[PDB]
Design a protein around this ligand. Structure first.
Ligand SMILES: [Zn+2]
Length: 142
């Protein structure tokens, strides 16, 4: 069916980020945040190189389900070059998309919109948010 094909296309984007992750590794001279989601057993180490308040670079290492690792990939791709304020606005928009609301759709959220499917399964919301919590934890360390 058509809804099925659209779901499959979304899923193919998510699997592209899971099997072709962006920004894998660990940055030198960076903020390091470790974060884990015991409710799925996902763990991530996010590093961020900030130029003042500009996300100059962001990498992650980790192990978890397709959702958490794909979300980390999409987040690192989406926030690079943005200021902290914009990254946090993107985090709030993503949270709203996760909660099922009408999120702000006039700022570059890139690949992240494929993760809207996950609002359908509440238990998987934690997977999708792991990286963003690390991001927030990262930038509340100034
Ligand atoms: Zn998970």
């Amino acid at each position: 069916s058509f809804n099925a094909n659209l779901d499959t296309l979304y899923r193919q984007v998510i699997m592209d980020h899971y099997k072709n992750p962006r920004n894998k590794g660990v940055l030198n001279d960076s903020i390091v945040v470790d974060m884990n989601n015991p409710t799925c057993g996902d763990r991530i180490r996010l590093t961020m190189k900030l130029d003042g308040d500009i996300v100059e670079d962001a990498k992650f290492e980790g192990e978890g389900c397709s959702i958490s690792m794909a979300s980390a990939s999409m987040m690192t791709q989406a926030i690079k070059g943005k200021d902290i304020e914009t990254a946090l606005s993107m985090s709030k928009i993503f949270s709203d998309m996760m909660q099922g609301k009408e999120y702000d759709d006039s700022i570059d959220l890139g690949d992240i919109e494929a993760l809207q499917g996950v609002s359908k399964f509440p238990a998987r919301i934690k997977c999708a948010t792991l990286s963003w919590k690390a991001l927030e934890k990262g930038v509340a360390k100034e």
